[PDB]
């Protein structure tokens with residue numbers, strides 16, 4: 204079965220690591236961090252890895268139940284919540300995943316909305332349940348962030364109106380802050396089972412192996428609750444590529460596919476890239492920053508090549 | 518002739534095309550009195566997006582634009598006038614043959630979400646809970662402007678890039694006018710909506726619409742509101758990619774349990790992009806979690822579906 208990519212322009216793609224549209228293609232050859240994100244990880248023959256799942260609505264989302272309000276040193280009102288799988292089934296800690304699928308894969312203060320729909324209904328209200336929602340922050344670097352153990356903590360500005368023992372949903376929206384004290388680092392993984400524990404079942408790190416090459420990212424800018432900053436999240440492949448590769452499950456015929464970024468209105472190749480078996484792109488570029496390219500552009504599979512293939516410089 | 522196909526995705530791998538939600542259940546309601554003419558999640562079987570439908574899951578019920586003025590509510594809350602652009606930031610051209618900017622909500626209600634702003638050497642930011650009343654006389658996205666309200670009283674900046682991220686509904690009480698089949702007046706109350714995706718309905722006796730249903734969060738109050746889409750967003754995205762020619766007006770599809778290979782039920786998938794089934798009851802369809810629709814063959818309007 205022939206390998207293919209979807210025909211989607213950048214303006215038709217979304218981030219696989221946070222629910223955002225793709226804004227720009229991006230390189231950073233001088234990146235010092237090990238790149239080992241866990242969302243947006245899929246092999247070219249369609250094997251999801253890390254914490255990756257198919258739903259755009261599942262990325263950095265949680266489902267579970269608040270247990271009780273808890274004490275915490277930091278500002279705000281804090282709440283412990285057990286987490287289940289996104290489909291509501293109990294998360295089985297013995298499953299070979301780093302954490303429940305969809306769990307955030309970076310250090311930071313993730314800002315969003317906690318909402319609740321009570322289990323118990325009221326006869327006088329037409330047998331309908333009570334609801335509430337509030338802004339919330341999940342600090343993924345916190346010792347209380349233990350999604351692999353089945354529970355996490357979130358903070359609210361709201362001081363009281365969060366109910367114990369009721370079905371709870373976290374909808375991600377952005378970051379609370381990127382001040383130094385908020386520990387945003389998109390390449391630093393959470394400790395999924397808590398401080399001092401080793402993460403397990405990780406999707407592997409990715410890196411260029413060929414001289415002059417660097418990773419190519421699909422970049423999205425992420426909203427902020429407050430403060431200064433223009434934070435970005437870089438994914439290895441957009442969510443639609445994850446979904447496509449999973450559907451197709453085309454056999455990988457080598458370790459590296461040659462792909463061309465094409466302007467369809469002209470049919471011309473803007474640049475070429477290597478699409479690696481483990482699901483990431485490299486290009487021959489020696490600068491950092493956005494790739495400035497016509498809006499109609501998209502990647503097209505050209506051929507399977509090998510480790511010795513030399514890319515045309517961008 | 519390129520063979521027609523549907524993606525192989527279970528219900529638990531699908532999302533709603535009318536609000537950013539996972540699909541929870543398949544659902545029927547034969548006694549529905551309303552005309553069903555939603556504008557998001559509309560796509561013909563040969564891949565033509567219609568209504569306000571666009572491809573991004575992040576675009577559904579989202580807005581992009583800039584705040585122009587603050588107006589205080591007579592009672593409580595603060596309202597903000599927002600000019601809206603296309604989701605890609607280009608100016609919305611009201612003369613384009615669309616009902617409203619693509620992604621615009623397609624129902625009456627108080628849509629709850631978050632407004633965020635990143636100012637035009639690091640930029641200042643703010644975000645707040647916000648509500649967009651799509652039934653409001655000030656909801657005129659086809660004219661390039663809408664209004665949203667905040668509990669926040671002051672900290673929303675004018676002339677700065679603004680994003681609305683939808684989250685759920687503010688309320689479904691009597692005063693909140695939630696009706697998933699009532700279209701907004703995209704240009705205001707005395708103006709006719711234009712360029713709409715057509716209404717959908719069974720045409721054969723004993724049939725009813727089959728919906729992909731999602732439950733939508735609430736900011737407060739009582740309720741268990743749901744949003745029903747005609748096809749999930751992944752089907753829209755698939756049909757658009759494939760652009761397979763439609764060989765009749767109606768495709769026969771089978772809902773299959775792959776683990777047994779057995780057909781659980783069959784359905785008509787109509788050219789304009791919606792399903793009907795032979796069912797005479799309302800409520801969820803109880804089906805194994807591994808189930809998904811598979812194209813069987815092209816049939817016609819007179820085909821008799823096996824009763825569910």
Ligand SMILES: C[C@@H]1O[C@H](O)[C@@H](O)[C@H](O)[C@@H]1O
Nearest residue numbers: 333334335364737738739
């Ligand atoms: C029914 C009530 O609606 C309000 O908005 C909520 O704040 C309460 O917790 C409760 O659910």
